[PDB]
């Protein structure tokens, strides 16, 4: 396909030429063609072996959770909300133009729910989604009980050293470590069958009801409503609560009037957001906005009218780099015991990390690459009656101690915080630290903050956060954990990682691995499990310079942390990621080695490079465990890339010739209204970020079979941007040129941006040259003008006599392209634009010539060129050269004839 597909709206894809012109009749309502109703919209699409694969989801979708029976998750058939999301394969049926016709249609059904699963789900509770307008102080939650309150009680740390052996806390120096955060105030937590609110607290430390469902709706909901009334063109004070309803609609939250639908519905609707296609599979994953708890592996062989089943992430073991890193995450999921009763969580029923904030998903060769953020999941005491941690989440910093032997392996396998709290505040000598200084009677023991006495009678259930933080507790360690600010005091100051907060996750998934997942999802009766063994994790905090005024040298906490966040988020503590995309390096590799491929993904403050070994389709590793897993590299944004609003991401393309990724941001995606219900007016324009590879890549020469330095990427705000125009599309014609299609008012306009030493700038003359197509598919040709086709002046026919070409046959002249380059002088419109003449025999004594000229996309066009099989009819000239004679084979017969005649 010599074309570009452009999503004109939620239903229509139009095909564009390299001349930024639509192919006529190509524009197609893919929803209508999928035989889907007018409630469906395109979520994502992809080309695989020349066919178009589309993910559609419905605004009418209604899901339910009934904790009893056991077909617990189902669609709501009553009314009209039985509207599952579909993937559809389209093929182009015509060889002239574009007639999309439907091939295969796959329904994305709701997860099976095992018994073991439904016991966790019964009491599963989920945080209200983070938005644009969520503040550091909105997130912040009331600090829970200390380790030594949980255990010993109201009472003393004069007995902390007498007692900590009788609660498996031997040598624990942290009686004042936090056991977590209160669910009586803050961001709303809700079961699968409940609805999140449109109101977010400004200070969640004071203003939320947390998981207090019943309390919200009889007390605090009327307060929120009177303080923060929806617009009605009202206006109020927004002293205690933002109103984010429109910001909510924006990120794909659905609504019956002013009330969001249930959590399970928003989970399903988000879950069907991104797609990728291999020879054998379609995989479907969720967006960067809500946590997703399941993904689809559809077998492309699937019979026509089947119901493809999603695999739970709680049933999907990843390799987090080392077993310890898994344990860290699983230990904090909840309390495990043979001794307790009805106390069910993901950990107690032997599930793993249940939820990801997925960056996106792609295919290279027959491999699915994904990445994303570990969505915080912890236990919470849902007990009723004198339970000390009642209504409290059970969470703790897991950040590596100061004394930790340095080098990555050691850092991420440090025993610090493994089974319970250890971190808080420490004033050794006069050198403050939040992290334990060391990790002597024997070695330091950590324990899960559920006191031995209540171990039988306690009720620890699972929750999921809206973000990558486990721990919302309004203490100083929380800020430092979230911002990447904990450092050792050795002769290098390597930064001390968490393994529960701000954890990024990526991998490459083989077709056998997708085969288990399909097996997990079809499993009769009990939960079948999947190992994905080509994965890694990484501590990836938000940058500390996206905040102000942090104290060191009244410690600053979440409720008081100051955001200066340039990237379209109020908050400066919760990381985000978007637009994972893979691509094959075009740069040759040494023969008998296979082509290189990577991926990239945007996170707050930087681009991440994932690196692969094409040999066995593995993550790049190196021998040393000191250097850190070489599959990952982080390159920080400058001011210009930091300024882009990441919540406006529209689409990411990769071009195999340039070896370059294009990230398109469209500001029309911003919500209509603020959290204070103020019309949003910077909703005009768009921006392009160009990502390239940097470093020494695998398999250049004998030296680069081995690598001990991770290849990385570089994001550059390219110069292609606007605060005025409405975007239709950006066509990356070449490294040297991009075409932008936009409306100023309401008609489409074509700008050409030219790369000048790494910075794109508009070229107004080339824009006018390209846009002057006169209704044709391609720019006009004018003989007397340097236009998009440069300028061609033919030699006069008197050139043949002067240079003695007339005595040659037309056939020699026609098979001598250097002679016939001497028939014209060419003036390029852009540097190194090229042109040749194609010759055609016209008679035994004459020929015609016509130019073959490169356009902006590096391709040659001539009289016979097509796009999508449609002749372009550009209008190149034909020039005639004439007078040629036969070669001298006659000389001997002729001079004999003359002699005989004379005789």
């Amino acid at each position: 396909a010599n074309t570009f597909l452009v999503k004109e709206d939620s239903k229509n894809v139009t095909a564009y030429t390299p001349f930024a012109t639509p192919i006529t009749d190509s524009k197609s309502d893919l929803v209508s063609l999928a035989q889907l109703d007018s409630s469906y919209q395109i979520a994502d699409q992809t080309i695989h072996n020349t066919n178009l694969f589309v993910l559609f989801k419905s605004r009418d979708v209604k899901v339910k959770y009934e904790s009893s029976g056991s077909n617990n998750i189902s669609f709501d058939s009553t009314s009209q909300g039985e509207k599952p999301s579909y993937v559809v394969e389209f093929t182009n049926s015509t060889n002239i133009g574009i007639k999309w016709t439907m091939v295969k249609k796959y329904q994305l059904d709701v997860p099976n729910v095992s018994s073991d699963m439904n016991q966790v789900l019964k009491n599963l509770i989920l945080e209200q989604p983070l938005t644009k307008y969520t503040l550091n102080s909105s997130l912040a939650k009331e600090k829970g009980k200390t380790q030594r309150e949980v255990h010993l009680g109201s009472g003393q740390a004069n007995q902390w050293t007498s007692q900590r052996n009788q609660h498996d806390l031997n040598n624990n120096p942290s009686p004042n470590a936090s056991t977590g955060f209160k669910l009586t105030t803050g961001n709303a937590y809700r079961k699968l069958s409940e609805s999140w609110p449109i109101y977010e607290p400004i200070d969640g430390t004071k203003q939320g009801k947390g998981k207090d469902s019943s309390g919200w709706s009889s007390t605090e909901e009327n307060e929120a409503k009177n303080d923060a009334p929806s617009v009605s063109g009202s206006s109020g004070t927004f002293n205690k609560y933002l109103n984010t309803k429109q910001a909510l609609e924006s990120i794909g939250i659905l609504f019956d009037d002013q009330t969001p639908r249930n959590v399970i519905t928003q989970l399903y609707y988000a879950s069907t957001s991104k797609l990728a296609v291999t020879n054998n599979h379609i995989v479907v994953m969720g967006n960067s906005f809500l946590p997703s708890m399941w993904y689809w592996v559809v077998e492309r062989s699937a019979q026509e009218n089947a119901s493809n089943k999603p695999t739970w992430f709680a049933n999907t073991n990843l390799d987090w780099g080392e077993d310890k890193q898994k344990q860290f995450v699983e230990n904090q999921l909840g309390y495990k015991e043979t001794t307790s009763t009805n106390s069910h969580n993901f950990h107690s029923k032997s599930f793993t990390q249940p939820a990801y904030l997925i960056s996106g998903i792609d295919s290279v060769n027959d491999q699915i690459i994904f990445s994303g953020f570990k969505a915080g999941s912890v236990g919470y005491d849902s007990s009723s009656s004198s339970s000390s941690t009642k209504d409290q989440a059970l969470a703790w910093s897991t950040t590596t101690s100061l004394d930790s032997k340095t080098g990555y392996k050691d850092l991420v396998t440090n025993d610090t915080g493994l089974n319970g709290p250890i971190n808080g505040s420490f004033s050794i000598q006069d050198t403050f630290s939040f992290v334990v200084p060391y990790s002597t009677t024997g070695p330091i023991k950590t324990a899960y903050p559920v006191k031995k006495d209540q171990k039988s009678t306690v009720k620890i259930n699972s929750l999921i956060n809206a973000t990558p933080l486990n721990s919302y507790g309004d203490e100083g360690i929380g800020v430092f954990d979230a911002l990447g600010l904990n450092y050792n005091f050795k002769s290098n100051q390597e930064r001390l990682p968490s393994r529960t907060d701000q954890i990024f996750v990526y991998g490459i998934v083989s077709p056998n691995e997708l085969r288990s997942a399909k097996s997990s999802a079809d499993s009769t009766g009990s939960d079948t499990k999947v190992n994905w063994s080509n994965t890694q994790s990484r501590y990836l905090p938000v940058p500390y310079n996206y905040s102000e005024g942090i104290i060191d040298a009244s410690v600053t906490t979440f409720s008081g942390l100051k955001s200066i966040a340039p990237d379209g988020f109020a908050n400066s503590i919760a990381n985000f990621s978007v637009g994972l995309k893979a691509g094959i390096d075009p740069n040759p590799v040494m023969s008998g080695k296979k082509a290189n491929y990577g991926a990239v993904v945007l996170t707050r403050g930087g681009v991440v490079r994932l690196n692969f070994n094409p040999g066995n389709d593995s993550l790049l590793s190196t021998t040393d465990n000191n250097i850190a897993p070489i599959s990952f590299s982080f390159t920080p944004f400058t001011a210009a890339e930091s300024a882009v609003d990441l919540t406006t991401f529209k689409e990411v393309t990769y071009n195999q010739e340039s070896g370059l990724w294009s990230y398109i941001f469209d500001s029309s995606l911003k919500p209509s209204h603020d959290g204070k219900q103020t019309p949003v007016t910077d909703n005009m324009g768009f921006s392009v970020i160009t990502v390239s590879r940097t470093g020494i890549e695998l398999n250049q020469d004998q030296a680069t079979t081995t690598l001990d330095v991770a290849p990385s990427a570089l994001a550059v705000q390219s110069g292609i941007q606007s605060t005025t125009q409405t975007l239709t599309g950006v066509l990356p014609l070449s490294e040297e040129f991009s075409a932008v299609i936009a409306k100023d008012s309401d008609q489409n306009k074509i700008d050409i941006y030219k790369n000048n030493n790494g910075l794109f700038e508009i070229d107004t003359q080339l824009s006018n040259s390209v846009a002057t197509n006169n209704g044709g598919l391609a720019p006009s040709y004018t003989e007397n003008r340097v236009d998009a086709w440069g300028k061609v002046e033919f030699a006069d026919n008197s050139v043949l006599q002067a240079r003695n070409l007339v005595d040659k046959t037309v056939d020699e002249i026609i098979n001598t392209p250097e002679i016939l380059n001497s028939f014209f002088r060419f003036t390029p419109a852009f540097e190194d634009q090229k042109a040749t003449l194609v010759a055609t025999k016209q008679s035994d004594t004459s020929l015609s010539v016509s130019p073959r000229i490169q356009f902006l996309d590096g391709n040659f066009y001539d009289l016979n060129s097509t796009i999508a099989g449609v002749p372009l009819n550009i209008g190149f000239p034909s020039r005639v050269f004439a007078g040629f004679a036969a070669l001298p084979a006659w000389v001997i017969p002729v001079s004999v004839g003359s002699s005989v005649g004379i005789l």
Binding site: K593, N613, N616, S618, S621, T623, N625, N699, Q702, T706
Partner: protein, 337 residues
Amino acid sequence: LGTIPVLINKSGDSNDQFNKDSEQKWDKTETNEGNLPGFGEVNGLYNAALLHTYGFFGTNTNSTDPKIGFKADSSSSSSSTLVGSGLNWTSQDVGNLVVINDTSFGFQLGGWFITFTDFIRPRTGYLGITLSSLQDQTIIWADQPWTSFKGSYLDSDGTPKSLWDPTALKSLPNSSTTYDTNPTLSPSFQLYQPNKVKAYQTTNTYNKLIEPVDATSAATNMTSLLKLLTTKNIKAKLGKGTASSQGNNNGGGVSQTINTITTTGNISEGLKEETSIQAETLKKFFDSKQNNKSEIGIGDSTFTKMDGKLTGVVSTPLVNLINGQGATSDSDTEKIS
């Protein structure tokens, strides 16, 4: 080749059986209930573990327990013999040497392809070997298995490949015809002798070497074991000896080695030491990778079926032809004359 022998007291026959449960104690290697032989055992290894990996007791290799094994008793004098693994491969089953590039080469060896990737240019932290195993049970449980290999070759997509045909196998030199052939002359058969041994001590069992006794009449007590010397009788008790093996009836075709990259066979985190003994840190490095062996360069060869017989291949620098078929019009060169 999979043909290390195992030491046996007990067969699957009536009242001769040995059990997976209530008769072996993996947690108590200090006493006779751990069943360590102490005489006649293959050097360097451990017999009861090898019997478990072969699945001669328990449902590990078959849909029901075969009950074949070894036991140490304190009540009486006892008898034993070595027997084969159930496999008929041998160390002469070596095929074509093939060269992949300027430094990497490999060959077929029975059910494996082996590669000596680093021999010309060694490196620290690399093990120097890659291996790909065949999967087809109809080949692996055959009676003269190497006769099914049709050759191995380099291919122009950049991999070594090999051909197989499950229809190529043949019977032994006789079908037993009229009598009970206990010594069936076959490529894994040997005239293993009786070992006769004194009663084990009930406690402190291994404080001294185990004592053998006159074996010159011992054969009369162990006739089930003498029948189990022939590999076909082992296969019959393991459920592999007839059509109960199932799978493809025909299914000849092409086999290919696992994919490879410059990282393949890097084990630098399992090599060297700074806390312990090198085998133990390599054991930790292997334990998380038991389900992911391909990055170590260890795995199974991929396979595709073909129609009809496979007889051989002929090779060119551009293409490989099977039975002499597979040639093409050379379409990129048609316009030159």
